[PDB]
Structure formats: C-alpha cells, structure tokens
Design goal:
Order of helices and strands: EEEEEEEE
Function: Possible cell adhesion receptor. It possesses an intrinsic protein tyrosine phosphatase activity (PTPase) and dephosphorylates EPHA2 regulating its activity.
Organism: Homo sapiens
Subunit structure: Interacts with GRIP1. Interacts with PPFIA1, PPFIA2 and PPFIA3. Interacts with INSR.
Subcellular location: Membrane
Family: Belongs to the protein-tyrosine phosphatase family. Receptor class 2A subfamily.
Number of helices: 0
Distance between the termini: 47 Å
CATH architecture: Sandwich
Number of strands: 8
Length: 103
C-alpha cells in the first residue's frame, strides 16, 4: 500500500567500480534523475553476490558509492544498488557483475 510503504520507482545510474580489488571491490554511482524520483533520497543499498555461488550479501551507506569486501579474486560478483526514501525501498539497479582483480 501507499501508506504502508511507497518507496521510489526509479534506480540510480553510472553504477560501476572505480577501483576493484582481489578481495575488495570499490564502487561509484549517481543519484536518480529528477524525473524518476517519488520524493527524496536518504541512503542506498549495495547488494553484492557471486553469480557463481548462492551467497547473497548487501550493504548500506549514505553515499552514492561503496566498497565491497571479503570477496574471491578473479570471480564475477553481481553487485547492484537501490535508492531509499523516507517511505521505504524501491527498485533494484542492474547488477554489473564486477569480477574482482586477478590476484
């Protein structure tokens, strides 16, 4: 329902890694276009998971960027992001599958 939970209807862009790592993986995206915004943003959720494994994990940060950790080297990692509003959560950005650097 609207009252119970509304959340945004749009996802951010420019989602990519500015400097991945064998174990860790940096990130850097941008906020949703003024057009696709059902209110205001407060934080984002970075959901990272190994497309090869069934281990799902995510993170939270009040910034348009983030840095994963505890990942395997030379392994594709499906990482995504999603904006959050005072109401709740919205859609989920398209994973990039940034494969950590080959140690």
């Amino acid at each position: 329902g609207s009252s119970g939970s509304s959340g945004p209807s749009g996802f951010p862009q420019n989602l990519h890694v500015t400097g991945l790592t064998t174990s860790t993986t940096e990130l850097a995206w941008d906020p949703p276009v003024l057009a696709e915004r059902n209110g205001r943003i407060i934080s984002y959720t970075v959901v990272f998971r190994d497309i090869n494994s069934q281990q799902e994990l995510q993170n939270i940060t009040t910034d348009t960027r983030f840095t994963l950790t505890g990942l395997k080297p030379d392994t594709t990692y499906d990482i995504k992001v999603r904006a959050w509003t005072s109401k709740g959560s919205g859609p989920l950005s398209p994973s990039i599958q940034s494969r950590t650097m080959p140690v």
